Design a binder for this molecule. Structure first.
Ligand code: NA
Length: 321
């Protein structure tokens, strides 16, 4: 409602009109609890945020079609979101709501009263921070862990030294000892000792050049459930993962620390990234730091548009989790 003391939530203000079509009115507290990026006042994407809000408020994600009706546009330009025409359009979809009412009769006529709808424990009350964590409509691409658990393992070097590619770009909050490599370390603003510091909430600048191996090594704190960690990490996949493509030499590889792709946003990013490499793997090396952690390894970059399904990564991550 207020957006008091928030300088980077232009994306959130762009969702207000879209939420209105659904009858949803979020205040500052509710914005913060749902989306970590809002709480920390960080750059973000309206569609991505709308997915989290749809999941929490309705118990289902955007793939239910609840907001697929073109009523309000979200326009992106010059690192800024607003509501000019000519952008992706969203809006509450009564047709989609009707379909949902088949499986969940108790929801009928309760969509647009600014109330949270939980079919699990059939309740209709004001927003509850612990309600509707995981979307009921979405079939998870791979197993998640039931309880988060810290894990002490080996260093990163033993995974990185095995990956082909001499010239390495390291995007991390801390440095790694990679002797066999020629490393260029990029860190967030404020970090000392790195070759370059940038605001990683704006992605990576293509002026960094192209490398044989790009290692994205940014952690995302655990919150609530394994699925939620994937959610909280998705934007990073989009931002740092996508921008890395302009920083890859022909035949280059991309290593990304992640936690899978349990959510819709994450799986999208992976599919997009996969089409650009000769192979794609989901790794759970001994150098993981937690129960939910893993690594994406995209090999041999040719900037192409090949066929890519997550069926093979789905089996790899089922064994990991
Ligand atoms: Na997300």
């Amino acid at each position: 409602n207020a957006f008091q003391n928030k300088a980077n939530v232009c994306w959130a203000k762009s969702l207000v009109p879209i939420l209105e079509t659904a009858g949803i009115k979020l205040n500052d507290r509710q914005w913060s609890q749902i989306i970590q990026a809002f709480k920390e006042d960080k750059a973000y994407s309206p569609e991505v945020a709308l997915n989290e809000i749809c999941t929490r408020m309705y118990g289902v994600d955007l793939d239910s079609g609840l907001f697929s009706k073109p009523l309000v546009s979200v326009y992106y330009a010059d690192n800024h979101w607003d509501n000019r025409p000519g952008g992706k359009m969203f809006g509450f979809n009564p047709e989609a709501a009707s379909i949902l009412e088949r499986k969940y009769p108790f929801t009928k006529g309760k969509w647009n009263i600014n109330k949270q709808i939980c079919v699990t424990t059939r309740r209709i009350e004001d927003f509850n921070p612990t309600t509707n964590i995981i979307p009921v409509n979405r079939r998870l691409p791979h197993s998640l862990v039931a309880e988060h658990r810290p894990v002490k393992g080996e260093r990163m070097e033993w995974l990185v030294n095995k990956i082909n590619g001499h010239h390495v770009l390291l995007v991390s909050g801390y440095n790694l000892a990679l002797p066999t490599k020629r490393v260029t370390w990029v860190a967030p603003l404020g970090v000392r000792g790195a070759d370059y510091t940038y605001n990683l909430e704006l992605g990576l600048p293509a002026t960094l050049g192209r490398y044989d191996l790009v290692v994205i090594n940014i952690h995302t704190p655990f919150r609530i459930h394994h699925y939620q960690q994937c959610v909280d990490h998705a934007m990073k996949l989009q931002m740092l993962g996508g921008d890395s493509l302009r920083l890859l030499k022909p035949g280059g590889s991309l290593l990304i620390r992640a936690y899978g792709y349990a959510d819709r946003t994450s799986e999208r990013v992976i599919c997009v990234l996969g089409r650009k490499f000769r192979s794609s793997r989901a790794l759970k090396p001994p150098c993981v730091t937690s129960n939910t952690e893993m690594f994406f390894l995209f090999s041999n970059f040719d900037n192409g548009r090949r066929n890519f399904t997550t069926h093979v990564m789905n089996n790899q991550l089922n064994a990991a989790f």
